[PDB]
Amino acid sequence: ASRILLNNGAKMPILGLGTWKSPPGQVTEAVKVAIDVGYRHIDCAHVYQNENEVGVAIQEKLREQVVKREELFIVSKLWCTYHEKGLVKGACQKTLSDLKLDYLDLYLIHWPTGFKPGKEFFPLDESGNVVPSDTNILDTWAAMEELVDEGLVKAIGISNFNHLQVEMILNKPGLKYKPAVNQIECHPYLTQEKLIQYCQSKGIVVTAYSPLGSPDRPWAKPEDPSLLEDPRIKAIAAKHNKTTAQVLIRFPMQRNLVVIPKSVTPERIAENFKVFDFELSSQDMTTLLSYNRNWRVCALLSCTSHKDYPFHEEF
Ligand SMILES: NC(=O)c1ccc[n+]([C@@H]2O[C@H](COP(=O)([O-])OP(=O)(O)OC[C@H]3O[C@@H](n4cnc5c(N)ncnc54)[C@H](OP(=O)(O)O)[C@@H]3O)[C@@H](O)[C@H]2O)c1
Ligand SMILES: O=C(O)CN1C(=O)c2c(c(C(=O)O)cc3ccccc23)S1(=O)=O
Numbered sequence: 001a002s003r004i005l006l007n008n009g010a011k012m013p014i015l016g017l018g019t020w021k022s023p024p025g026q027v028t029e030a031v032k033v034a035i036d037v038g039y040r041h042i043d044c045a046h047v048y049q050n051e052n053e054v055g056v057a058i059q060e061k062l063r064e065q066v067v068k069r070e071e072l073f074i075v076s077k078l079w080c081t082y083h084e085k086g087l088v089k090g091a092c093q094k095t096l097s098d099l100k101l102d103y104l105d106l107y108l109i110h111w112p113t114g115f116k117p118g119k120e121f122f123p124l125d126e127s128g129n130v131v132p133s134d135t136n137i138l139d140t141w142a143a144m145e146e147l148v149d150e151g152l153v154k155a156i157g158i159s160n161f162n163h164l165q166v167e168m169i170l171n172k173p174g175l176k177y178k179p180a181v182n183q184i185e186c187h188p189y190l191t192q193e194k195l196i197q198y199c200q201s202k203g204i205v206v207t208a209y210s211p212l213g214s215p216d217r218p219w220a221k222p223e224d225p226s227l228l229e230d231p232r233i234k235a236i237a238a239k240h241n242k243t244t245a246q247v248l249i250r251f252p253m254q255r256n257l258v259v260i261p262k263s264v265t266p267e268r269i270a271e272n273f274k275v276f277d278f279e280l281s282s283q284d285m286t287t288l289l290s291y292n293r294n295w296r297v298c299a300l301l302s303c304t305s306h307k308d309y310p311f312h313e314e315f
């Protein structure tokens with residue numbers, strides 16, 4: 001099966017294309033190529049500042065009848081400065097407008113932390129601390145539920161929520177729609193066994209982000225842990241006649257996760273999709289899980305003083 005059933009009854013492709021740090025002048029071609037080679041899931045966000053260009057690609061392939069809208073699974077995320085109840089619909093509508101869609105398949109709260117609304121995505125006080133919003137995530141969630149009921153989104157979920165935060169939504173008084181997905185960092189150096197087992201046990205599907213360790217993240221050092229260059233992972237890859245990236249993408253698929261590797265390189269977009277013709281053994285899987293070191297590439301460090309900072313909790 002190339003798709004996983006969500007708790008809203010829809011089927012979500014377990015492989016998608018990520019678009020963080022996809023430059024705007026390259027992402028239209030990247031999404032076009034991805035759709036031509038078989039991808040049906042694109043992961044987007046307003047904060048990435050490239051949704052207009054993603055949308056141009058989607059619209060061209062719809063117009064070309066390469067794909068039907070029904071067959072696509074388009075995901076976007078509500079940024080931190082729009083957690084206020086009265087700003088959620090507008091933010092969604094801006095994303096829809098840019099993507100040139102009339103609905104999203106999934107819309108996520110990007111982070112549990114709300115920030116002061118305004119032009120700035122990371123509003124700072126004069127000492128450099130991020131300025132929080134007093135709007136609690138239960139109220140943001142109610143606003144997300146309204147989007148389902150207005151037909152703008154088919155599913156809602158969360159991202160970078162820890163177990164206590166997931167639990168808070170599942171325990172929300174008068175909860176109407178449960179989160180469909182929790183999108184979190186996951187890779188052999190950050191395997192997330194506790195949080196994944198919890199979410200799956202509640203029927204929330206987990207999407208693994210930065211499955212290659214995000215080597216284009218700002219300031220990445222060669223001397224930092226590198227999944228793509230780990231000789232132990234290379235060794236598994238070679239054993240299977242696959243690339244290290246293909247192993248890194250197949251790994252979460254075999255944990256019943258969704259995975260969203262990013263590329264703007266046509267040959268890599270294509271390579272990255274060639275992950276449905278081999279199987280890692282149970283021993284390969286246990287070996288990859290053993291490389292866990294609790295190493296996080298996306299820790300929102302500028303926001304550790306924020307009330308809802310998610311990564312102080314061990315999971
Ligand atoms: N929810 C959130 O907070 C959150 C956080 C992080 C990520 N995400 C989503 O997850 C996606 C994936 O995470 P990520 O972008 O952080 O990093 P990633 O997918 O782990 O790594 C992307 C990097 O890997 C390179 N790459 C891709 N395929 C390769 C291959 N086959 N061989 C060698 N290098 C390859 C890409 O290079 P090129 O592009 O140059 O080919 C890019 O530099 C994001 O783009 C975003 O959609 C969401
Ligand atoms: O759900 C929709 O929006 C309509 N379609 C499906 O239900 C469906 C479709 C396809 C397909 O186009 O390839 C394959 C399906 C396979 C199994 C169940 C529903 C499948 S669909 O025509 O997109």
Ligand SMILES: O=C(O)CN1C(=O)c2c(c(C(=O)O)cc3ccccc23)S1(=O)=O
Nearest residue numbers: 001002003010011013038040070071072
């Ligand atoms: O994504 C593809 O390349 C083709 N498929 C569909 O479009 C699709 C599929 C499924 C499924 O396999 O369960 C379910 C679908 C449900 C709704 C629309 C398209 C659905 S699919 O056969 O993977």
Ligand SMILES: O=C(O)CN1C(=O)c2c(c(C(=O)O)cc3ccccc23)S1(=O)=O
Nearest residue numbers: 020045047048210214217218297298299
């Ligand atoms: O880029 C920003 O200004 C803010 N965020 C990041 O620092 C970040 C983000 C993502 C993502 O949301 O896809 C991925 C990151 C991967 C590695 C370091 C920082 C990553 S982000 O939430 O946009």
